[PDB]
Structures are given as C-alpha cells and as structure tokens.
Symmetry: D3
Subunit: 239 residues, 6 copies
C-alpha cells in the first residue's frame, strides 16, 4: 500500500515536471520515456496508466498516458494541474481527417477543438466555450517544426465522444468548415488548463482519411510518430 | 505485428466468450481472471487494456477492462458486441452515493442510468433515451445475491463525464430522486447493447459517500469487491 | 359543495388504498372496479376522472383514470403520492409498437420509458433522468404473468407528448434500440414516484403495430385487456 | 359498437359545428351546452370527454372538453381541425396569475402563450415558434367584452406541463415580462390551428393569485365563469 | 465632446418623444423625418445611427434607425425604454415571405415573432417566450390601414440571426405554419418592451418572395414604403 | 440608382481589396481611411455603413464598418468573402474585460471567441464549433505589436448578443476561464471565414473593466485606438 495523492495516480506531489506530454496509449508513454527521456523514472502505474518523469536535453519533462475520451483525459489533467502543479500539457496524439487537403501522415497542430460533449457548456452557463490552445504552446510547436523542416497543418480539431459515428452529415460539415483533425480528447484538456491559469496544446498525426479510406501502415505510423514527437520535445524547450 | 480485428483489440474473432465482465481498471480484470477463471488466456493487451477468456464453473466467460468514462466503454463494448459477437456484458464497478440510506460497502444493482453525456440524445433524435439494464441480467444479479445472502440495493445510477464535479445542486437532485450510485460508464453501455439486440447490466460497490465523506479503506474495498464479483460470477451461470 | 383535498380530486384523505391501478380512460377505471373490485365505492368524479376504492382478493386496492398525456398523469399521481399517501401505482394501459418482434395483443411490461417531454430534464438540472420502473413492481408483474401462463414482452417504452406524430426517423430509431411500447404517460409517472420515495410500474397491451398497420379489433382488445388486468391485479397481492 | 371517426371521438363527420368552444372539464362542457346552447345534442362521450353540438342565437356552435395539458388538447384539437373540419376553436378556461396588476376574478384574453413544453420546437426545427392567437378571434373577444361592459386584461399566457411547479425563479420571470395568465393548454392549441390554416383563441378567468395566495370562492368562480362564457359566446357570432 | 446619456446615443434625456418609429436603415429614418415630421431636429448621430424628434399632425413623434439584427435593435430599444422613457416603439421594416398567399408589396402587421436567437430563452429560464406585439398597437395599425383603404396581412413573423440562410427545411416549416414575414429584428424588440411595461409593434412590407423569387423594383419599394409609413404614422395618433 | 452587387453594398465587384479591416462604427471606418489610407475612395454608403478602399504603405487595403452584433457582421462579412472575393478580414474593435490581470487601455489579440448566439451550433449539427482566428493572422498581429513595442494580451474573447446583460454568474465564469475580452461580433466572423476557406482575426482595446468599473476617457480611447490600429495596419503587410 502506497499513499495515493489522487484516486488515480500514486505519484508523490512533486514527482511530475512542470511540463508534461500526454498520449492516449500508456504503452506509447513508456516508449517515449524509454526512447527520448534521460534520468527517467516511472512515477505512476495505477490502472495501467503509465507515467514517467525525467529530462529532455537537460530540462525536466514528464510523459503519461491519458486513456481514451474526454472524461478520461479530464481526470488525469485536472489532477496534474491541481495536485501536481503542472504548468504546461501537450497532448501528442493520432487523428483522422476529412479535409480534402490533409493527407495521411500529416502533422496537425491544433489551435482550438470543437466537440459533441457537454462538458464545456456545463462550465459556461450553457453557452459556447471554445476549447482553445495556448498561443505560446501553438507557436512553440509551429516554430519547432519549421526548424526541423517538417511540414505542418495548423487549425481546428473536433473531439468526439463516439469513435463509431453513425451521424449523417457530420463529415461534410467538418470538411465545409476546414476542421483538420478528428480525435477524442483535446476539447476536454484546454478548458481545464484555463481553469488553473495554465497552458495546453495538442499535436496529432493523421492515421486515417475518413473520406478516402486511406490508412497509414504500421511503418508509416512509426515514421509519423517520430516526426511528431521530435516536434513536441523540441517545443518543450521553449516552454 | 499481429492482425488487428479492431483498432483497439488484438483478440481474434471468437476469442471472447458470449458473456463478458468488464471493469474500469485493466489490472482488476487481470485479478478477476487470475483468481476466478480457469482455462484462462490473455486475449488482449492493446493500450494496456487487458482482456482474458476462460471459464467460470465450466461455462465460457471473459473479463476485460473498459477504462474510464462513456467514450472509453463505448469503444470497447461496441467492438465486443459487433466484431466479437458477445451477447451479454456485465459492468462490475465501484461508485459513490448520495443516497441517505445507502452506505459505503453496499452492493448496488443498476436498473437504469442517467447521464450528463450527449451520447444517448444523439441516438434518439435529441430526445430522452433511458439507458436501461436488461431485466434478465438484473434479475440474475438479484437472485444470485439472495442465494449468497449478500444484501443489495437495486435502483438508478448516474453516469457522469466529470469525476471532479463543480456543479451546484446536482447531489441534492440525485438524492431527491433516489439515485443510488454515481459512476461514469453504465449509461454508455446499455444503449449499445440495445443497438445490437444484446444484453447488459451493471453492479457496483460503494467506495465513497459523497455527502458524509465516509470512504472505504483498502481492506474494506477488497471485501466489497469479493462480494460483488461472486454475485456477478454466479449470475453469469444464469445468463 | 364538498371539501376538496386537492384541486382535482374530491376524495377524502384516506379514501385511496396504498396500491392504485390507473388507466387513461375513466370509463375503463369504472369497468375495472365493477368487474374486479369488491367492497367498492366511487371516491372521485371531479372532471369526470372516476376513481374507486375497494378490495381485490381481500387486499385494499383503488383504481382511477389518469387522462391522456404526461401533464395529466402528473397531476393525478403527484396528488395520490403526496396527499393520499399512496405507496404503489401501476399504470395499466394500451400502446403501439414499432418492434418487429412485438405483435398486436402482446402484453408489455415496462422497465423504463423514454420521452420527448421536458419534464424530467427540469427535475435533474437539464440532464438525462431515466424514467425507471421500480424493480419489485416489474418483478411482481413478470411473476404474475408467468403463474397465469400469459406471455409477456419486457423492456423500454417511449412516452410521447404528440399522438399525431409528424416526426421523420422516429419510428426507425425506436425500432433500432428495441423500444417495445409507444404510449403517452409512463415517463411522467416514474420520476414522481421517485420524488416521494414510492413505487411505480406500467403494463400495456399492444393495440396497433405502427409499422405494419395491424390493429386489434374490439373483441381482441377486450381479450388483451382481460389478460393484462388479471396480471396487474395478481401483482398487487405481491406489493 | 359505433364506427369511430377518430380513436378518441365517436362523433360522425359533420357532427361538429365550424366553431367550437373547449374547456378542460367535460362536466363544464355539459353545463355550457345545457345552459347556453339550443338544438343541442351530445355527439361524443368517449373517455368521458363530453362534446355537444347545437346553436347559440341561431348560429351553429359546439362545445367539448379537452382534458388537462398540452398532449390532451393536442389530440382533441388536431382531430377537430383535421377530421371534423372545424374552422375556429376558442379555449374557455381558468388560470392563475403572478402579475401584480391582475386580480382574482379578472377575465384574461390571450394574445400568445409561452411554454415549457417541447411540442413547438419540434414543429419549427428546434427554434422559437410563438403560440399565437388569431387576431380576428382576439378582437372578437375584446369587442364582445366591451359591448357587455366587462373589463378584460389582454396579453400573454404561459402554458406549463407541470401544475405542481418546483421551479425557482419562474414566477419572478413571468411577472417581470408581464405574463397575465398561467394555465396548461393554449400553447398547444395555437400551432395546430396554424397547421390547418384555421383559427384559435383563448379566454380565461383568474381563479388564483400565485403570489398573494388569493383564491376565488365557488360562488366567485361561478360569477367569473358567467362573465367569461357570455363574452366567448357573443364573440362566436362575429366569427 | 458631448455628454453621452448612453454609450450609443448622444441625445439628451427628454429628447425622444414617448412614441418612436424605428427602421433598420438610418438613411430611411432621415427620409421619414424629412418627409413626414414637422418641428424636426436631429437628436443622434453616434455610429451614423440617425435619430430625429418632431411632430406628426401636432403629436410628438421620433424616428431612429436600429441597424440590422436582434443584438443591434436590442441595444437601441433597451436604451429608448430605459434612459429615454419611451412608451411605444413601432418597427417599420421590410421583409421576405414564404407564404403562398402573401405577395411582394403586401403590408404585414406582426402579432408575434419566432426566432432562431437565444435571447428570449435566456429571459425565461430556457423556456419558450413568445415575442408578442402589444394588442393596442396591432389594433391601431389594423384600423389605420382600414381607414386608408390599404389591404394588410396580419400574423406571425420570423426573426432570424442569419440573412444568408443555409438551413434545409426552414422555408417549408415557416410556410406550413403560416408565418407571413421573414425579417431580423422584431423578436428582439417585443420582450424588451415587456421588461419595461411598455408597448411595441411591427409593420413590414414584402420586398421579396423567398419561394418564387419575385422581387420588388425600386419604384415598387417606394410605393410600398409610402403605404406602410402612412399606416404607421396614422396609428401613432391612436397611441 | 446604382446596380447593387449585394442587398447591403453598392461597391462594384473588385472594389474591395483582398485584405479588409472592419470596425463596428462606420464613422471610425472613415477616420481610418482618412488618417491611414492613401489612394482612398469611398466604395459603399448603403445604410450609412461606410466602406473605403485604398493602400497602406503601397499594399491594397479596405476598411468598412460592420455594425453591432453577430447578425450584422455576418451579413457584411459573408458578402465580402463571397461576392467581393476578400481573403483576409481583421476586426478592429473595442471590448470590456472581467479578467483581473487585464486593464483598461490594454490591446487584446483574440485566438478564439465564445458566444451565447446559436449561429455556430446551426453550422455544426448542434455541436460546439469554436470560432477560431486564423493562426497566421494572430501571429501577424502579435509580431507587429512586438516590433512596435506595444504590449498585448493574447487569448479568448466572448461575443454576446446582449450588451445589457442581466445574467447572474456570467462574469464570474468568464473570469474563471480567463476570457480576456467581452465584445459582440468576432464569434460570428471566424466561422464565415472558415466556410469560404479564408482568414480572419480580431484585435480590440479595453474600454471598460466590467468588474472594477474603470473606464477609459475619450483621450485614453484615442490613444488606445492609435496603438491598436497601427498594429493591425502593420500586420496587413504580412498577410
Ligand atoms: N477516425 C478517428 N475518429 C476518432 N478518433 C480518432 N483517433 C484516430 N483516428 C480517429
Ligand atoms: N464519487 C465518484 N464519482 C464518480 N465516479 C465514481 N466512481 C467511484 N466513485 C465515484
Ligand atoms: N400509436 C400510439 N401512439 C401513442 N400512444 C398510443 N397509445 C396507444 N397507441 C398509441
Ligand atoms: N395555478 C395554476 N397553474 C396552472 N394551471 C392552472 N389553471 C388554473 N390555475 C392554474
Ligand atoms: N429575405 C429576407 N430575409 C431576412 N430578412 C429580410 N429582410 C428583408 N428581406 C429579408
Ligand atoms: N462591456 C461590453 N460588453 C459588450 N460589448 C462591448 N464592447 C465594448 N465594451 C463592451
Ligand atoms: Cl482511438
Ligand atoms: Cl474513477
Ligand atoms: Cl391515446
Ligand atoms: Cl388545473
Ligand atoms: Cl436585410
Ligand atoms: Cl457596443
């Protein structure tokens, strides 16, 4: 038995760096730690949601899984900002696209995220509350990709509660308004950062074109991941 | 590289029994398999979401984690009913309560679940769609608890997207209408079972009284879990 | 002039039994009293909404009309639970069906009811509040039908405010999710029972198949009614 | 057994006049017929919902009960306009008031009605559809009251689904915006008249002041009714 | 620098008459003042939103532009009723129609207005609040047109936030329920008048048939305007 | 009579530059043209909504008023992007703030805007659609202010339909989530730019602190305007 600083995390207060990368898959968090962090230690394994703290190019950095969907990321991010006193979270993810000018393997940097969830209406008296990335975070991601000569798409994501959509007309509306990324979490993250006066952003790679059915092979997803993670890691040095 | 029958599960079609127990924590799924299943094999580990198939008292039974929140359980349950041809899912969970006559350690059998999620409005043209447990499943749980001489509370749950509620008046309304369990997933499960012409139910143990702040110790949570899981396992023999 | 214990009921406090059957048509309430109750007296005739109190197999039982729609049943049921101190109400009704495996003359026992009304959102801070039958009531109805060798369908109803629907896609969604009964009142009854810590259920007979246009003749509706009412009456002995 | 032209009315097509008065209480419909119509015959008694057709000062006129709430009046009025080819319906009712300058016994002529029902949003793509009385009907009521030297209040009603309101702040908002009448049906009537290219209005007498708790005695309600019904009857001669 | 009695109006308190005509186009307000008012002075030019005060047939009358859309008219009308102590506002506008029996050049007198705006839900606890014209104002407009032998259509308007509609099915629903006028402001005006215990109405001329594409030429719009404005001006003498 | 390319703009197609600054007050548009544009001509005066086209430091640039509120800016911006083929619109405005660390005279660069309007839900199947500024526009504004040594606040705006708010709790929620600017138009602009595959942004100066009641004097508003307009003009050179 270890003392539990939160109901979902056994890390001691102070065991997370002020900057954290988060991805849905805890096994990918372990890969990030093993392949890119130094001075690394595992700080959480509750519910299998692996988290790690170390350094990237000497600067403190943590990485942890967030699970799938807005309610899951909301638990983990609320705890990180509130109990662990984290200042910056960058979600590092995968996404689909409907945009005709976005292609599988593209790197998407998210400026704001729409949603079919109610969580943000509940925060703003039933009104429209845009889940908005912090500008310094967006800029750090854009500038890191430029320095690395990796092209990026910059624009809106859409975070859905329903992976297995049955909703007629949704893809056409997302395309009409140039949503570049379809995923499941970022719209839950940004308002929590706001509540705590903290910062968040999101970068994703396109695994699937929802319209054309193009899909990245395993090797292509590894190459896309390597590009995205290098951008995110370099961006942390500016944050 | 293994063939992926779904984007989130590496099990081969046929590797799940027709009856599945699911809990949020994949590590608890492993405990259930190790302590209660025979003939057991691990059939999934994608995203750390451990799943297992074996037998309980000779009858095929699987157990798998579902993660936290409606979007997470929706992914896993949709796949189980659709691709894996599962017929019955029982969620085996923990919950809070606001009800003045429900106490920590109590076992709650869920007849229907409210929610603050939009997922069910989206299925029924914006209207009220009650997330409703199958009657045969509820009855099997009630009758198994009676045969085991374990008291139960039977009634409504409330599945929220927001573990860290900031909503004034919610607890008072839940208590006024005798909601017995507050959790995060069951309202997403029941309508998916309906879509597939299949069955679902939920049984939870009370870990926390949201009003009085009573909370179960680790030893008390183990005892509650042992009672709940025996009820669920015996119920599968009737299903 | 008689003293009015409520604005809609001239019965004296205590003039209703703790268990009440209610149907939409007050003339059917009179038929139930005349054909199945002993020791019977009329206790209300305000607005023509006939109500009666007597005994069924020696046990106190009342029967009263509720009129058509959620607002009408809400008035009468609120008064019964609050002023008349009733403990159990069973709605005994007729319904349509869209379900391909439900047929005209079938007896449907309701576990929960959806709706297009706002009344339940207004009770639960705008959220989804499932109108849920009490499990002991559902079980008593199921077991009484079994003892009488009368087949039943058990599952969800949908209570609409609009008998003359013009809503495209509604029937297809109701069928997709296996709603067995379409009627107009039960979703208003169950939350009122909850408010008062009391019990409610509903049993209906299928008069019409909304898809195939099959419709019960007058003789068939009498036979269906005789089956349903015997089930409900026998169930009261267990409640 | 009689042929049923609708599921709720045994009147033969043509048995209703083109102008119909409707009140909630079928027993009050009988009183109106007995005391004010000549050449009168009962044309419906299904569900006890008495309806009558005769003449008032030589002009064809019917009167029928509508029951309590929007779903009930919607059934009866839809049938009257569609099957019975009625052209004008005037609801003749009772109401409460919150308005500080409206008093018990006052006669209120309704120009439009708000609601907490969803029925009108469902007709207009989810938008705000004002339930609006026909101007010729309103004018006929106003001018008849003037000729009879009976004072009237003219303005908005509010039609609620919930007689037993638990809603904090509702009365204060209704008063702030000068709603003169609180009742349960008119907002359902006016849009149905619109659908059929027909006309509707409403006149009510104040039985209760919701704020001060003033309440009309039985004798006072009879006097108020006599004033209101004379206004409505005289108005039919202009319609 | 002049003292600003409101943030949008430089008129001194008392510089507006108790009765005000308002139109969207400030240049049309100037035309009305120049061609129909005597004793006229310009009292506002902030934001170009010209307003004037003078007399019509000896009676004090003002005219001012209101701009386009509910938020714009709401600013100006709130200020007029609150700061300037205005008692009656008549909107004098143009509109489209979908109604098959309404034609270009017709004069429409508005009894109530629907909307796709949220402003009225926000005033009435999320419910349906009909934006309703004052009956004395409607009657004054109707009677003035009759005395001038100018035909009118009387009925509902629909005030939209979106001139450039992309909404499938809207026109068909508006036609089904006999909305006579499509415009952008009146639904915002009427509830503000209510808040202040004051009066409002609206009269419009049909510039365009939304279905047939008929459109008034410039000369036809001038003739329609001359008819409408004479009706409105004469109506002010009765108010 | 001039040909009207749109119902609200007499400019000939081609008479607007590809980049346009817009402000609410047409008189401020004239001031911008007179004081900062060369080669300038007035291209619109319909409804007094002055618009001008010229050059700023040799590059084509237009400036036009947009009026007050989402419906007004939506008309003008839709026309500019669609008929006039504009590529970039920057709203140059004033705002209030509730943020404790934002002060009167501050320059706010908007990354996204919330709203109480329905216009964006109507574009995205009822879901949350964030009104999001284009990143290149935001960056151009930020970098221009830096080069000019003018401090800026960067973050979310809130666009309301109701200048005269009566909404309890709104300011506290806006402050909790660090909304920096309260205004009335930007949330309508950004989705229209998206529809046309075009770009938009917004920069405002704080005229009023909604909490402390601090308010800029006329001289202070002129100084703030001079800072903001120089930032916007310099940003156009990068766009
Ligand atoms: N198509 C998709 N939909 C939702 N979330 C996703 N994450 C990756 N691809 C996705
Ligand atoms: N208090 C609580 N709220 C939500 N989900 C829970 N699961 C267990 N306890 C819970
Ligand atoms: N088709 C139907 N729709 C609604 N309520 C009903 N009650 C009986 N049949 C019905
Ligand atoms: N107070 C009230 N509320 C609702 N409907 C009514 N009808 C008469 N009085 C009423
Ligand atoms: N077609 C139309 N739509 C909206 N407002 C209008 N005003 C005049 N014509 C209109
Ligand atoms: N306080 C305020 N509210 C809304 N819009 C504004 N524009 C400038 N100040 C404002
Ligand atoms: Cl996924
Ligand atoms: Cl949890
Ligand atoms: Cl019916
Ligand atoms: Cl009543
Ligand atoms: Cl217009
Ligand atoms: Cl303003």
């Amino acid at each position: 038995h270890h003392h539990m600083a939160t109901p979902h995390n056994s890390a001691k207060v102070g065991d997370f760096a002020e900057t954290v990368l988060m991805c849905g898959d805890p096994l990918r968090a372990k890969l990030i730690a093993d392949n890119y962090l130094e001075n690394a230690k595992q700080v959480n394994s509750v519910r299998g949601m692996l988290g790690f703290t170390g350094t990237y190019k000497g600067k403190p950095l943590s990485v942890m899984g967030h699970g799938m969907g807005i309610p899951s990321i909301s638990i983990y991010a609320e705890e990180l900002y509130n109990v662990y006193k984290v200042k910056t979270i960058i979600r590092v993810g995968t996404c689909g696209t409907v945009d005709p000018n976005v292609h599988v393997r593209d790197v998407c940097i998210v400026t704001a995220s729409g949603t079919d969830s109610n969580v943000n209406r509940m925060r703003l008296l039933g009104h429209d509350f845009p889940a908005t990335a912090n500008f310094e975070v967006v800029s750090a991601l854009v500038e890191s990709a430029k320095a690395l000569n990796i092209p990026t798409q910059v624009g809106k994501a859409y975070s859905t509660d329903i992976f297995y959509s049955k909703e007629q007309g949704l893809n056409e509306a997302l395309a009409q308004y140039h949503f570049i990324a379809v995923e499941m979490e970022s719209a839950g993250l940004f308002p929590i950062a706001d509540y705590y006066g903290a910062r968040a952003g999101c970068i994703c790679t396109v695994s699937d074109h929802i319209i054309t059915h193009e899909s990245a092979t395993p090797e292509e997803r590894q190459t896309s991941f390597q590009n995205m993670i290098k951008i995110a890691l370099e961006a942390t040095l500016k944050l």
